[PDB]
Each structure stands twice: as structure tokens, then as C-alpha cells.
Symmetry: D2
Subunit: 457 residues, 4 copies
């Protein structure tokens, strides 16, 4: 048995979804320790992990699974699969219209075209499981792409991305070349770059041949390019995360709300501008010596600084959590979680008709299904519980899902969300009455958000 199915089997025996996420990441970069990685390497340097084990990722994804997908599923060119080549320093795209049947795909492959699968998780349960778990410890959507390159070729031109990449060599070997950010403004880039030329590139800060099992990491801003060696093809999966998840993004949402609050709460933000600032402010006056200009600029600077006092940091943090819930992949349940949830509730048929399949009582111990599937949020004064359980495996196919939380249950809801994975008697929930104590537990159980100590039926 490969280390991968062996860790997956282990994962099925780990109760805490949070701990599972930590465990899988640990596995992903073994033997390097997580704390060292996140504190010194993350968003700072390209890292390589030679695992001396060609069977490490075995079971995650193979060229055979790709072939099986194109044949079994409705794979579409462009939307799901791309065909590209990089010859004579030029990037080419031979994407045919419509479905990508095996016959067309392999014909392009033979023609030296690389094949790129955009959303493996939408078609592979293993890949879905992998990403679904890792997203919980990234605190950001974790996506993926699969790349298959023919012998003696290069599918894509050199460039850097707007996300943190994790390259998992799955089959064959390939020569990688990773460069350190060329200039200060490219460090931790916000957007993807245009295809670069070999001349515009400097000296590789890292150049090696990856083999099955190896892991290659590098933050956004680092240019990279790879090519297959002679007579051997390459297949690898790239895990990506942290797209537009910066302090700047956080501020972009904070500021508008801050100025509005400042104007409503403090009269100094409501006072009129001078009647003649147009005489010394503006491009025409960029070289003015009018002392009023200096005073004007100093006032803008202080007012801007004073905005931090009016910044609804918690609200914006909740809004980002909400969006994260929407971007999240649906959860992967363990045998236990499923068996102890509505998803494992059996249905008994008596005389052809379903005979009461089961019901929650005040003597039932429960706790959230998993740790990263729901988030309480305030909007318009009311509370709403946003969750991932109904999300599709395909990015944003489903709209935000939520269920309103009434004030007489707000505390009980926070407890459950904050006490995971501690079993709490439903009768011990902090509510007004027993009714609100059981209606909450039932609603949450029915949606598949809560699990019980022992099966109800």
C-alpha cells in the first residue's frame, strides 16, 4: 500500500477535521516540519522536497484516470481541458471546439501538445478529498490543475502566477526552472504575468529534474518553466491557494465602510472643504509653494489615519469567511461522521411504504459535523448561518447557502461552533426554553450540519 492511501486510511480514523487538515499538510511536505515551513519559507522562498519514493502520491491521479475521464465524463475543451505547446519561443493553443473525446486528446498529445485539466476535483473523488481537507488549514480556497506533457517538449511559456503553487510530480521526470522575483513590484504579485521570453529571464534560483514523489513549492511572483527530458513523459498536479487573500484586499473592503461610519459619527468628517482649495491643489499646482497646500495634505493624512478607529474589522472578517464558505469544496465525511449524521440515517420499508425510516431528544449529545463547514454572520441586523454542505465540487455552481438564526438561539449556535469537537447535551444548550433548545438541534441535524453521539436509527 502506498503512503498516500495509507495516510488517507489514517485520516479516516482521525475525529477532528481540523486535526485532519494539519495531518494531511504534514504528510504533503514530509519530512519538513509545518511550523518551519510557514514561519520561514511560505511566501518567501521556493522549496524542493526529494522524497526518494516514486510511490508516494500513488493513488492520487494518473494518466489512466485522465483517459478514463475523457471517455466517461463530459469533458469539454477550453472549459475543462486545454491543449498547448511552446515551440520557437512561441506559445500555441490548439483547443478544438466542444467535447474533448479521447481520440482528439491523444491525437493532440502525439502531436506534442501538453494537456492541462482545469478542475480534477470535479471529476476525481481522491483529488476532491485531498483539496477539501487541505483548504481547512489554508483558510483559503485550494484549487488544482493536472498537467500531462509529451516526451521532448514544453507545453507552456515561462511566467509567474498570482497564487501559491505546490507541484506534485506524479509520473516520469521533468526539468524545472524556478526564478526569484525579478523586481520589488513582482514580489508577491497580485495578478498573473504575460508570457515571458528566455531573454527576459535571469538566473534560476532553483533548477532540477523532478521525479515521482517529489514536491516543489514556490510563492506567487516567482517565474517558472519546465520541459520533459528525452523519451519520458511527465504528469504532475499543481495545488494552488491564496488568491487575492492579502492585507490590501482586507483594507479595500474596510475603507469604504470606515469613511461612511466616520462621516455619520463625527462632524469633522462632515465639514466643508475650503472654498478655494482648487487654487493650490491639483496637477497644475503640484509645484505650488502656497503653505495652504502643505496644510491641506497634512489634514488628508490625519483624517485617513483617523479612519482606522471607524473600521468594522470584525464585520469584514465575517464577510471574507462567508465568501470562503461559498468558494469551499463540499466536505468529505469519515465513516463515523456519516454514520452519526443524517447522511447515515437508514430508511425502513414496511409493506412497500417507508415506515418511519429516528428523532432528536433532550438526552442527545451532539456537535458540529466538521469544524470548517459553517460560519455565523450578521447582516441587516439578523444572523445567518452560511455553510458548505450543499456546495458543488465545481467552483461556484451553487449560490451562497444559509439559514437564519434567531436571537433566542444565537448563543447556543456560537457554543456549538466554538466547542467543536466537544459533545454537548442538547438539553444543556444555552437557550430560553427547551423548544428553542431542540428546534435548533433539529434544524442543524436535518441540514446535515450536526452529528450525534450514537446513531438515532
Amino acid at each position: 500500500m502506498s503512503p498516500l492511501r495509507r495516510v488517507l486510511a489514517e485520516l479516516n480514523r482521525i475525529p477532528s477535521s481540523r486535526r485532519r487538515a494539519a495531518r494531511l499538510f504534514e504528510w504533503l511536505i514530509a519530512p519538513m516540519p509545518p511550523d518551519h515551513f510557514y514561519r520561514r519559507l511560505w511566501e518567501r522562498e521556493a522549496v524542493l522536497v526529494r522524497r526518494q519514493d516514486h510511490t508516494y502520491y500513488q493513488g492520487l491521479f494518473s494518466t489512466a484516470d485522465l483517459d478514463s475521464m475523457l471517455r466517461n465524463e463530459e469533458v469539454q475543451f477550453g472549459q475543462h481541458l486545454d491543449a498547448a505547446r511552446y515551440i520557437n519561443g512561441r506559445r500555441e493553443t490548439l483547443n478544438p471546439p466542444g467535447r474533448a473525446l479521447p481520440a482528439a486528446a491523444w491525437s493532440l498529445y502525439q502531436a506534442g501538445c501538453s494537456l492541462r485539466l482545469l478542475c480534477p476535483q470535479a471529476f476525481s473523488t481522491t483529488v476532491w478529498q485531498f483539496l477539501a481537507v487541505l483548504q481547512e488549514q489554508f483558510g483559503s480556497m485550494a484549487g488544482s490543475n493536472v498537467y500531462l506533457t509529451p516526451p521532448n517538449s514544453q507545453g507552456f511559456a515561462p511566467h509567474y502566477d498570482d497564487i501559491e503553487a505546490f507541484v506534485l510530480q506524479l509520473e516520469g521526470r521533468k526539468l524545472w526552472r524556478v526564478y526569484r522575483p525579478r523586481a520589488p513590484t513582482e514580489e508577491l504579485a497580485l495578478t498573473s504575468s504575460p508570457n515571458f521570453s528566455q531573454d527576459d529571464l535571469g538566473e534560476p534560483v532553483l533548477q532540477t529534474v523532478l521525479e515521482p514523489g517529489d514536491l516543489l513549492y514556490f510563492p506567487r511572483g516567482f517565474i517558472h518553466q519546465a520541459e520533459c527530458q528525452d523519451g519520458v513523459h511527465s504528469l504532475h498536479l499543481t495545488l494552488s491557494t491564496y488568491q487575492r487573500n492579502t492585507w490590501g484586499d482586507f483594507l479595500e473592503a474596510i475603507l469604504p465602510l470606515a469613511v461612511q461610519a466616520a462621516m455619520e459619527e463625527n462632524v469633522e468628517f462632515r465639514r466643508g472643504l475650503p472654498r478655494d482649495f482648487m487654487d493650490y491643489m491639483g496637477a497644475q499646482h503640484s509645484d505650488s509653494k502656497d503653505p495652504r497646500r502643505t496644510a491641506f495634505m497634512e489634514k488628508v493624512r490625519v483624517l485617513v489615519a483617523r479612519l482606522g478607529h471607524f473600521a468594522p474589522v470584525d464585520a469584514v472578517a465575517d464577510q471574507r469567511a462567508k465568501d470562503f464558505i461559498h468558494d469551499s469544496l463540499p466536505p468529505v465525511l469519515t465513516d463515523r461522521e456519516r454514520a452519526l449524521s443524517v447522511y447515515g440515517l437508514p430508511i425502513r420499508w414496511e409493506a412497500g411504504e417507508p415506515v418511519n425510516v429516528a428523532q432528536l431528544t433532550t438526552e442527545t449529545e451532539v456537535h458540529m459535523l466538521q469544524d470548517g463547514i459553517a460560519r455565523l454572520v450578521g447582516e441587516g441586523g439578523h444572523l445567518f448561518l452560511y455553510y458548505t454542505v450543499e456546495n458543488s465540487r465545481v467552483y461556484h455552481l451553487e449560490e451562497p447557502k444559509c439559514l437564519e438564526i434567531y436571537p433566542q438561539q444565537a448563543d447556543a449556535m456560537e457554543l456549538l461552533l466554538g466547542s467543536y469537537p466537544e459533545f454537548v447535551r442538547v438539553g444543556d444548550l444555552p437557550c430560553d426554553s427547551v423548544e428553542d433548545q431542540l428546534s435548533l438541534a433539529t434544524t442543524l441535524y436535518d441540514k446535515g450540519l450536526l452529528l450525534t453521539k450514537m446513531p438515532l436509527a
Copy 2:
């Protein structure tokens, strides 16, 4: 002549539009000094000026003009004119559909309805000049509304506005009650309030009967209400300005551009947020004692404070200047300005042919801007544009923004012209790298009605 006619005749002999604007405002609040007014009263107190001269505004606007325009102009109920009355503590609008003919308007007036004309500057050249000149010293659009109230009646319910108001009593008399901001959040209000009841009101900070010639000023946020007492009717013009022209409005436009620039120019703004901040940030974690929450909060305040360094203050001032130019009323030219510009060119059709057709400026022609507040140089998308007011309609926003592109090789000369008004400068002395660039810029500006010459062209 009346004081108004005299001051207008005076303005026609003042060469600088900037000086004309200062003089008219001086006249508006006389004998009170503008310095004192803006330093202590503007946006702070309600002010009353007892003129002791019922003829002060003679010539500005009268009931006779209102009657005249209803008959000779296409005044529409609801777009141009409102008919309202306040009765039993309730506000009611009786605006019939369509055109407001004399009979329809006057019969409402006789029924106790007050008449409100929304844009008098669109139909009165005197009000137009009055506002066009004053806008230049407010640095903000100056609008107006005329109110005609019949005897023993009140047209509107108590309420406060979102603009600075100057009330000019033209005819009759009226009892005014102005109240201070009720609560701190209503001081210098951002939006107009809903109608209030006599119950919602406390005690007037100012209660007086206005007489012709008098002036009453009060900032946005101050509640007001007026009624005609037994005997005479009332007619007044309310000059308004400073709608959404606050420090907060300037910041609103500056913030998005500053964060974007910070992210593009400094890595600290591009760094990733923590992977687990959702564990201590949020409404559900407000009381958390996690020391990371303290650190998070501090980082936000530090980054926000640093944004000031990236705020494109000049670009935002120009965008606001551009918007002001779009909201502006077209200029009112003195006799001299018109005679020295393309508008006063003698070219005309005589004997089946255009005559007076040989006038064209040269490098020896001395020029300068037509007026001081009619154009603004604005940079947008790596290009330079000159926005102007000369083609604006007397009707608010009827016309779209008007501009002409200024090529790089002529920018310094354009700025010199905008900055040295009203000093005459010879075309040959404009700072361009070519003689033809000088001529080209001066000709383009003149033909657009943005430049005048020292002596008429021939």
C-alpha cells in the same frame, strides 16, 4: 438705481471675474465683512442681516416675472414648478399633470398654495448672472429656488436641508423660525431630513419677520419653517450651495486609489493574511482574549495610517474640479470680454457674402483666458484634457461634460495661461518648443471661446 442695479453696473467695470465674484458676495451680506462671515459664521450659526432698505434686491426677481414666464415659457408642474400647502400639520402637493398655465397656477395660489420655481436661472438672466458670479467664490455649484406664499398660509412643513442656505426677502413679509441642530449627528447633515411635526421641534434659535432687502443665512442641518401672517404675501429667493462638498467626500474618492497604489508599490500590502485569523476575528470573537487579535487590530491601524502616503490628492482635486465645471452655469460676459473674444467678432452676412473675414491672431497678439473659472486642466489615462464651462446650459446637466485634448508639447503653455490670469501674454512668448505650437494652442483656445485678445482681431 437700486443697490442691485448699481452693483451689477459696477461688476461690468471690474476686469477680473475672480474680483467680481468677491465683490458680489461682499454686496450680498453687506455690511458684514466676508472675512468675519466665513471665519465665524459659515457652517456654524444662523445669521440675519437687517438691511434697512426695501429696495436692496430691486431687479433680481419679482412676482411679475413669475407671472410673465408662466405665460411666455413652457413651465411644467413638477419639473419646473411645485404647488404645496401645509395644513393641519400635514404637507400636501397639488401638482396637476403637464404645463403650469397662469390660470392653473394662480387659482392654486388663491386656494392657499405656495408656489415654488425650481430653476429660475433657466428663465431669468439676472438670476443667472447672480449665481454664475457667486459660484466662482463658493467653489461649488450655486443653485436657487423662488418661493411665493399667499397671505395667511404656510406652504411647507418644518425640515432641514443638505445645503447651505441664503434667503433673500424680495417681496412682502414672512415669519421665520430657524432651529439649531437637534442632535450631534444632525449638525452639518449629509442628507435632507423628512418632514417634521411641530412636536419634533424644540425652541427656535432664531425667530423673526423678514422684510424686503433682508438676508437670512443658515447651514445644512438647521431646521426651518416660515409662514405668511395676516395681510401681505411673501416672495423670497433661496440661494443654495455646498451640496456634498465635505472632507468626507474627498476621502471617499481618495481611499480606493490609495490602497490600490499601496498594494502596487509596497510589499507589506501584498503579504498574505494569516491562515487562521477567522479563529479570532469576527462578530463571534469580539470578546476573544487571543493576543493575535490584538496584533491583528494593530496591524490594520498601522496600514490604514500609512495609506495617507499613497493618497493621490492632486488627482482627486482635479476630478472634483472637473465635476464642478460640469455642474457650473455658463459664464456671463462683460461688454469688454465679449468685444475682445470670438463672440464679439464682426464677421457677418451682408450682400450675399460673409463680411469682416480677415481677422486671425498672430505671434504678436496679446492674450489671456476669457475668465478665471471657466476651465480646468485634468489628467486622465496618460492624457491631458481641458474641461470647460462655456458651452454649458443654464439647465443643470442638460449638457454632457465638454473638453478638448491638450497635447504634451503644449501643456506648459496651457498651465501658464490658466495660472497668470488676467495678465496679458503675447502669443510669441508662450512656452512651447515650436512657434507653430504656440499659434496652434492660442488659435484653438480662442475659437472655442476660452481666450480674449488685448484688442479686437482684424
Copy 3:
């Protein structure tokens, strides 16, 4: 006094607007009888009328009026004025952006450009009356353009239009070449053609030099071109009408309504199509002889023929009338019509207050519609609405469709008034089931300016 001024003074004398319209049109083509014109020439032949009177149109429009307009009005290039020239077989458009000042317009003129004023009626009261009166006998919108061409030049390339044209030569002379429709599909063309080269044209069916006073008419579809000869410039006004006012345009509106009524009222239109008609219908079967195609085609012919039974002809004529009312120029009232309607109602002022107010009609008052083509009763959504032109702008579509609801109880009276103009009818004699309904309808119409009385109310 010129013929034009003499006929306008005559028109003010004629109590019926229908008759005034008929009179001006006979004047426009005199001495040719309109009966003969509409019977054989209209939409069939180009027509030239040698007036032998150079003063015929004096007072309608002149170059000085154009010059005066550019100076006293806000004429915009593109929107109101086009500058063009046809040089080396190519049409050029030299429109500067912005306002068309005299200096700019005349400079263009001196360079060889023709000037075309798009909406003269919006700036000339005489052209307005001229068109407002003529639109009434055309039963279709009447527009105009003024063309000023400098000596020794051609402003536009030869082409044909989608409207019926009447050319009135106002000043100078000009060589015109009018051609008959090149092909059958070009006779009475649906749209304007692109510019053509001198080689695309055929032989002129009419070639002549127009002099002031002359009239030239030609149907849509007829290619035309004109050039000024040596030493003399040309000025003419082109009156246009009948844009998209054909039987086909009528059918376009009636067909969808007819089909939907047929489907809702006759089961035969609701029957399912064959399950296999796709096997024999379609482009890839157009040469097939399958007897199924023949039966399919037969069914279509029969069903389509029956649609005439379900065609709401009256409702569509009303919709077309309604659109014409929306397209109409506001009416030009005679002195009598103004004095006998609400527009001529005096307002008696006493002690600075209006006391005259508004006069009142009684069951004894004699009345009739202000004019014959200013209103139309239209049924919509189960209700009845009276659409009118009295609040229309002289600028095309500046105003939205105006109407007032007519209640069922006053519909017969409303129809009577529209159908009996200009006969006076006592209010008390209107076909309503109550005195209140008679007074109510007449008062509403009078107040809106749609009705006049036999004697001034006051």
C-alpha cells in the same frame, strides 16, 4: 408684402385648421391644382413649378436668419448643423466638435463647404408655422432642412431618400439633376441610399436651374444632386414627409395582433403541426415534389388568408394616429383661437394679488375643439385616452406622449367634439347622462387648452 406674408395673414383669417392646411398647400404648389397633383404626380413623377416670382417665399427663411441663429442660439455641429463638401467624387464632412459659432461656420463656408441646418422649425417661428400647418394635410410628420451652398461647389453626393421631397428655392440659383428610380426595387424606396458615383447614375429625367420662388418635388427613390454655378450661392429649404407611412408599415403592426387573436379565437390556429413536416419542409427540400409540401403550402395560404378577419384595423389606425400626434409640431394658434381659449384668459391683479382667477363654463356655453388635428381618442388596456399635441416641443420627440383619461360616461361626448369640428356645440347639448358629466368634460378640455368658446369667458 410678399405672397408668403400675404398668405400667412390670410391663414390667421381662416377659422378652420383643416381648411388653413388645405389653403397653404394649394399656395405651396400654385398654380397647379392639388387635386391633379395628388391624383397623378404624388409618389409617381418629379415635378417642377416655375413660379416666375422671385419674391414668392420672402419671409420664410434667409441667410441672415441663419447667421442670426448661429449667434443668438446654441446651434451645435452634428446635432443641428452639418458642414460638407463633395470634392473629387467624394463626400466630406468637416464638422468641428461643439457649438457652431458664426466665425467657424462662415470660415467653413468660405473654404467651399455647404451648410445644412437640420431643424430650422426649432429656431424659426415662420418655418414652424409653415410645417405645423402643412403636417395637417399630409397626415404625416413634416420636417425640413435648410441648405446653404457657396458659389462654384457641390456639398453633397448624389443619392435618393426615404421621404417625399419638396424643394423651395430661397436665394440664388442651383443646377439640379433628378433621376428616375434605377431599378424596380428602388421605386418608392424603403430606406435612404448610400452615396453614388457619377457612373452609377443614368440619364437625368429632369435637369434645370432653380431660381428663388421655384418649387421642385420628387418621390422617395428618385436620385438627385445639385451644384451651384459660377458666382452665385444657393439657399433652399427642403420640406420632407411620408417617412415609413406605407401599407406595408400598416400590415407590420396588424399581423402579430391578428395571429394572436386568431389563435385565441379559432381552434384551427391552435392545432398541432405535423409530426413529420420537417422531413419535407426546409431549404434542402425546396425542389422536392412530395405532395405533402403542396398540402402544407395549401394550409398556410388558407390560414393566412383568414387572418384578415381577425385584423384589428381600427386599433392599429389609432396607434398610428397616436404616434403621429407624438411626432407632431405643437399648434400655431390664430389670434381668434388664442383669445377664445384658456391661453387668452386675462389675470386681473389688484393690490399685488391675483383676483380674476379663472372664468367658468356653463351648460349654456358654446364650444368646439381648439383645432382639428391636436387630439385623438385611443383605446388601451381596456381604458380610453385622449392624446394631444398642445404640449409638444418644437424639437422632435423632446417631449414624451401626453394624454388624459376619458371615462366611459364621457366617451360619446368626446367623440362628438372630435367629429364635429368646427361646429359650435352647447355644453348642455353634449351626449352625456348627467349635467355634471357635460360640465366636467368641457372644463377638463378647456383647462388643458384643447377647447375654445364662442365668446371669451372673461
Copy 4:
């Protein structure tokens, strides 16, 4: 092996898709002959078929399949599944938001609510094959719904539909009540009716209990209602077709295009309307005796009738076929079609490299269209296009319309293939003036999965 599995296997053996459709429909209404059904019952009468065999449908759909769907599929409430109950003369809808898990669905069931699955063909491979074959002989989209009703209850209120319905009893019994059209306008209704009250209903034309295997058909416009009586639940599948596929619908598309062609092709439809038709046409002239009114109406009648001559029947037929291709369910290939098509080309990754790849066609290969109802040639904007259904989703309109351009050098050959089905043709026998375009088209078609070869290329 039930009668259903028997015919399905039988179908897999049948070569032609056209004959498979005919065969399945025959099987669907057995013993009743299709010819009789379509000739006298289709769109004319309600029909009952006592099969006397409760296993006639075994394999099509079951309550266990529904249970499996709710378990192993993302079934959404409202989107895929509905829950309702008709009690006390009122209909209720207790659809909770979110996914429809077994527990919630079954809970509503026991609560007396019926359950309706809206698109079973998207989750059932058998329902998909069933509809995919039947759509081919209807010439219109064939859809379906599944209804699960608990004992002693009724889910839906009585009402009629806008589609032709075929009810297949699958499990249990249910008391059905069908009513003939209440009035003439309701026969072959255009749209679904609202919920009716028992009182709004007359006497059923059919009132019988259905048993597993029975078939109940009734036209759009026929009201119906069904209920379970005692201790027995019911499960049926309703097959619907012919939504908006009437002669009227064909006419709606043809008429606008016909009016335009008539106007461009015949000058009579391009002539101007009379100048004064508004004087005698319109609601206000409904009772006019003017002889011109009669002539106007008679001319409208004839012009409408003549439009049929200009109707593009073939192009509209092609557009409707194009729409049907869009609405069509994807093809359910037979083993032999698969093996002979690009879908059955054995080329799979072996030895770390694609094996057995490269098998192409030659001028000596015999090929015919994969099936008979998956493509349609359409001419648009002067260009030729082939629209197909092979890439359609089982989910209605989830995929946009798909087509490929066919150049002139191969059009004739394409139609040849479209009409030749199901007999083979040598690629060298294509009608093309070059072997290049012969192989080009044959390949383009085989790669898209629209063509099958006589002998497996691999």
C-alpha cells in the same frame, strides 16, 4: 425479462433510429394501432389502455430509483423535486429550501404530501433512452415528470395543461378523472390553466382507476385530477410533448418575414397610405358610413391574403428544426453504432503512451450518419451551418446550440448524407470537385461523432 426490457433489447438490434422510434411508440400504445391513434384520437380524445399486465413497464422507473436518486444525487427542492398536497379544496406546497435528502423527502411523504420529480431523464438512463427515442417520432421535445402519491391522499388540484400527456401507471393504483374541454377557447389550450375548484368542473368524460401497466392519454386543454384511495400509494410517469408547436406558432414566425419580403419585392406593399385615412379609420369611426372605410378594409383583407405568397416557409421550418435540435435530448447509441463510431474507437493509454491511435478514413470507406434525428442543415446570413445534438446535455438547454460551418465545396455531399440514411456511401463517391474536400468533410463529420463507418477504422 419484462415487455419493456424485451423491446429495448429488440431496439438495440434495429439498425435505423427512425424505425426504433416508430417501434417504441407502437409498443407504448399496444394493442392500439398508431395509425388509428394519430388519425382519430391524437389532439381529439382522452384515451384509456387497460394492459392487463402489471409488469409492462418493469425497468422504466421505481420508488427505489427515486430513493436512490435522493441518496446518490444532488436533488434540490423546487429545482428537481416538488412536494405538495391537495386538502380541503386548497392546494399547498411545502417545499423546504435546499437539498432534498431522503429523510426530508420521505418525511413529507408520510405527512401526506405527494412528490414530483421534474427531470428524471437527467438521473435515469432508462427514462433518457425512452424519451430520446420517442422524441424522434413526435417531431417535438419529449419531457417527463414522475409522481409519487401516498395512500388516501391527493397531491395536485384539478387543472389542464399546455402539452399532450401520456400517463404511465408504474406502481399501485390511482383514481383518475379527466374532463373534456369546458369551452371552445379551452380546446387545445395555448397555456396551462390556473388551479380550478371542484365546482368549476362538470362531469368527467372518463373516471377510472389505473393499474400498473395501463396507459392514459389526453390532449392539452383537458382538465384532470387523480387521487389514491386506501392503503395503496401510486407512482406514475407522465410523458409530455408538443408545447407550442401549433400552426399559429408557425404563422407568428412567418408573417413578419413575409411582410418584409412583400415590401421589398412588390411596390404595391410599398405605396403610401392615404393622407386622410385617419378621418374614417379608428375606434371613433367604428360606425362611419364613409365608402372609403369599406374600401380600406377590403384592401387590408386582400393584402393580408397575398402575404402568404411571400412567406419563407422553408427557412422558418429550418429555424424550428434548429430549435428542436437545441431542445433535443442527446442520442442513446446502440452497440453497433458505438463500435462503428469515433466513440468506440479503441485507443487507450498503454505502456505510458497512446496505443492504436491514428486510424483514419480513406476514399474507399462506406459511411452513413450515426442516427437519423441528430442533425439539421440550416442556411443563415448567406452561410451554411450544420447543427447537431450529440453534445447536448440530458438537462434541458444546459448546453448552448452547437453547429459547424459547411463550405460550398461540400454542401451537396452533406445533404446527400442527410438524405441517404441509413445506407452507406463511399467517401470517393461524395459530390465534390476535389478528393480533398471529400476526405475533409468525411473526417470533420467522423471526429464530431456524427458519422459511422462500415468497417471499424480500428
